[PDB]
Amino acid sequence: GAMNSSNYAELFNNDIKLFVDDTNVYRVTVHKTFEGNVATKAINGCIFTLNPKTGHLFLKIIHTSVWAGQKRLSQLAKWKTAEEVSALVRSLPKEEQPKQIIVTRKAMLDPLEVHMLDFPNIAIRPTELRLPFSAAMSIDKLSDVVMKATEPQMVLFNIYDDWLDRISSYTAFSRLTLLLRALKTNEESAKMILLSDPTITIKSYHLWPSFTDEQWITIESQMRDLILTEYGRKYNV
Amino acid sequence: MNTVPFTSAPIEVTIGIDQYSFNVKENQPFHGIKDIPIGHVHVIHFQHADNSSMRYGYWFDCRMGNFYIQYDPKDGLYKMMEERDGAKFENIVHNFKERQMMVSYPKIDEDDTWYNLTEFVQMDKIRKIVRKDENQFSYVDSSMTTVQENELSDPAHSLNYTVINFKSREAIRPGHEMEDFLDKSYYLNTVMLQGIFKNSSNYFGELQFAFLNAMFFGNYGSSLQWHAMIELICSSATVPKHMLDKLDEILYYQIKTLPEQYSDILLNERVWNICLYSSFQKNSLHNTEKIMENKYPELL
Numbered sequence: 001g002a003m004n005s006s007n008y009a010e011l012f013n014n015d016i017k018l019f020v021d022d023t024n025v026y027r028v029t030v031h032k033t034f035e036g037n038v039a040t041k042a043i044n045g046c047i048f049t050l051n052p053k054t055g056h057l058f059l060k061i062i063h064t065s066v067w068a069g070q071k072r073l074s075q076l077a078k079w080k081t082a083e084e085v086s087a088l089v090r091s092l093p094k095e096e097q098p099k100q101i102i103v104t105r106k107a108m109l110d111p112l113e114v115h116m117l118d119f120p121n122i123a124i125r126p127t128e129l130r131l132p133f134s135a136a137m138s139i140d141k142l143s144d145v146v147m148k149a150t151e152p153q154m155v156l157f158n159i160y161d162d163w164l165d166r167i168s169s170y171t172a173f174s175r176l177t178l179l180l181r182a183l184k185t186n187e188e189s190a191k192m193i194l195l196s197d198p199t200i201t202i203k204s205y206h207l208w209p210s211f212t213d214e215q216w217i218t219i220e221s222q223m224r225d226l227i228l229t230e231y232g233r234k235y236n237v
Numbered sequence: 238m239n240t241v242p243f244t245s246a247p248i249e250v251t252i253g254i255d256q257y258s259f260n261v262k263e264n265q266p267f268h269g270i271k272d273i274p275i276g277h278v279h280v281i282h283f284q285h286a287d288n289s290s291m292r293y294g295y296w297f298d299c300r301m302g303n304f305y306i307q308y309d310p311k312d313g314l315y316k317m318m319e320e321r322d323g324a325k326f327e328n329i330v331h332n333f334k335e336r337q338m339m340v341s342y343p344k345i346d347e348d349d350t351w352y353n354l355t356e357f358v359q360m361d362k363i364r365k366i367v368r369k370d371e372n373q374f375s376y377v378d379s380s381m382t383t384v385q386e387n388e389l390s391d392p393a394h395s396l397n398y399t400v401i402n403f404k405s406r407e408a409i410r411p412g413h414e415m416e417d418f419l420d421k422s423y424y425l426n427t428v429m430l431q432g433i434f435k436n437s438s439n440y441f442g443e444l445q446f447a448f449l450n451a452m453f454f455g456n457y458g459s460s461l462q463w464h465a466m467i468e469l470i471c472s473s474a475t476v477p478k479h480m481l482d483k484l485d486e487i488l489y490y491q492i493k494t495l496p497e498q499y500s501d502i503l504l505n506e507r508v509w510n511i512c513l514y515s516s517f518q519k520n521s522l523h524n525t526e527k528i529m530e531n532k533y534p535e536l537l
């Protein structure tokens with residue numbers, strides 16, 4: 001059934017699974033027209049498809065040309081997501097195909113179920129977790145490749161960098177969700193935290209800074225303080 | 238006019254014949270039902286006074302044979318049987334008619350309710366949904382499950398309604414996933430009407446039969462089938478104009494005939510609100526929407 005805090009260790013067992021987040025697929029700017037009406041302009045988007053055990057991220061870039069001449073784009077975006085996830089599964093060797101796909105938004109359930117009819121054994125599950133994957137576009141290297149795309153494109157990343165050499169998947173996912181929650185709550189301050197010290201760099205082949213174990217403890221504590229701070233500023237506590 | 242005689246009424250029972258129902262007392266002298274209109278299917282149904290568990294009954298057409306009812310004290314139910322001796326039957330019926338031992342089905346210079354509820358229902362199609370090829374009449378009861386219900390356990394006692402499933406490969410063409418899920422016209426018109434039912438009359442026949450089994454026997458799987466067949470039409474953007482007009486008449490009489498006190502269990506809020514207010518055909522069911530709003534404004 002639905003994924004929640006009670007069955008949370010299931011994410012890090014040995015059954016292949018993917019999270020699918022569709023938040024950033026259909027992205028618009030709302031602006032005024034010369035006549036004083038309101039119009040939207042779409043910008044490139046992406047599907048965020050993540051294996052939480054390995055860190056492997058299948059970032060399918062959604063180029064604005066997809067939407068040309070189409071109606072009801074927010075509905076189309078869910079079906080486009082499901083089409084692309086199904087295409088990804090079919091492209092994978094059988095032993096790499098997931099046994100479960102967890103959608104972060106329940107409106108993806110029926111579109112994905114219908115697109116995956118050929119895969120009766122792949123379970124499509126919602127979750128009651130509020131995961132912060134919408135903030136993927138606050139990661140500079142992911143945002144850069146999406147915005148520069150001139151055509152549909154899939155780009156593969158490891159969202160954990162080399163962390164799994166030193167920590168477990170459970171811990172790596174917790175670090176990731178903390179970083180993304182911080183970037184979602186106050187992007188400027190989170191980015192300031194991550195880049196404050198100029199002697200800590202991002203390897204060309206990585207997404208995050210090369211922190212030592214002790215610096216990650218410092219960073220993580222600073223992220224927790226940020227989230228609680230904003231929770232104070234937000235609710236006056 | 239035709240007759241269904243009863244050998245006797247050894248146990249106290251409520252007897253239904255089409256939309257009428259009446260009571261007979263334990264060992265009260267009673268030999269059956271006369272003046273049954275020729276040209277329609279009919280259903281004769283039973284609910285025992287001592288155990289209201291299991292409503293059960295028989296679909297039949299008097300043109301297809303001479304049928305009577307006889308209580309079986311071993312299996313504990315009223316059974317329909319066919320009498321092949323035609324002169325014996327006429328003579329039994331004549332003795333019962335002379336002695337005024339049969340209740341009279343209403344005549345009435347005005348009613349069309351039963352016609353309107355069974356317009357497209359044919360015995361031959363009933364006998365393919367209810368498989369018991371040695372009898373010309375068909376038994377249904379409260380507990381019988383449908384083929385689709387069994388997929389999700391005795392196959393010979395099943396209601397073989399046409400399986401409808403909106404998230405199935407039959408319903409969804411490869412490459413037209415969104416199109417076919419949001420607009421069921423290709424499933425309705427190509428797969429079901431052209432492919433399986435052959436015409437809309439057979440579709441409406443199964444829809445009408447499903448409703449009547451839900452209403453008369455409280456058959457839950459029949460209620461599911463009735464709603465699915467309605468939803469498949471209302472969720473199609475492209476439906477022949479004559480089908481929509483006829484569907485409105487069909488549902489009108491079904492809603493008119495439904496007991497007001499059975500609506501809580503016999504009507505599915507989601508399907509009806511979607512069909513009357515959200516679907517492609519939200520503006521095409523004027524008679525049905527008017528009677529639903531005046532009789533069951535709560536559900537909506």
Ligand SMILES: CC(C)Oc1ccc([C@@H](C)N)cc1
Nearest residue numbers: 259260266267337338339340
């Ligand atoms: C012998 C005579 C025909 O028995 C009956 C008459 C009426 C009824 C119901 C209609 N009150 C039942 C049985």
